[PDB]
Amino acid sequence: STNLVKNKCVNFNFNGLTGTGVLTESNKKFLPFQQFGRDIADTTDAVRDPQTLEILDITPCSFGGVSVITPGTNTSNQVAVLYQDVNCTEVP
Amino acid sequence: VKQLSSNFGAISSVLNDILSRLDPPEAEVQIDRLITGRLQSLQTYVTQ
């Protein structure tokens, strides 16, 4: 029963369900019997922590394709890189 | 996205489980069934 961590991309194994995600507070109201919550396309987007019975959202962590903007090798060797789909607080 | 939830003939549709509960030499047969199957689903999306 290792302690919970939030807002970090942490691999997780709950009561038999395992995935890698950032776990954050959830506004979803789960009925008592329900353990996990799945969105359309069979992906688990919510889990209820067994120890404190609290609903925690799961969101995949960042993955975007770096692209390189080059003035052209003949003009210059400078380049600028676009990390796609990343809020620029997680790039380093 | 749904084809990611189909066995294609392996023991399971989850890569973690096939690897976790099987020995390394015999898991490769089961992953190769998923890789041939999942690759066929991507070739059909790209042609269509």
Partner: peptide, 20 residues
């Protein structure tokens, strides 16, 4: 145009259009 517009995951990303 307003009338017209109103009437109208995992490894997958939707790139944005160049002319907004």
């Amino acid at each position: 145009e307003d009338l017209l517009f109103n009437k109208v995951f995992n490894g997958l990303t939707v790139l944005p259009p160049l002319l907004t």
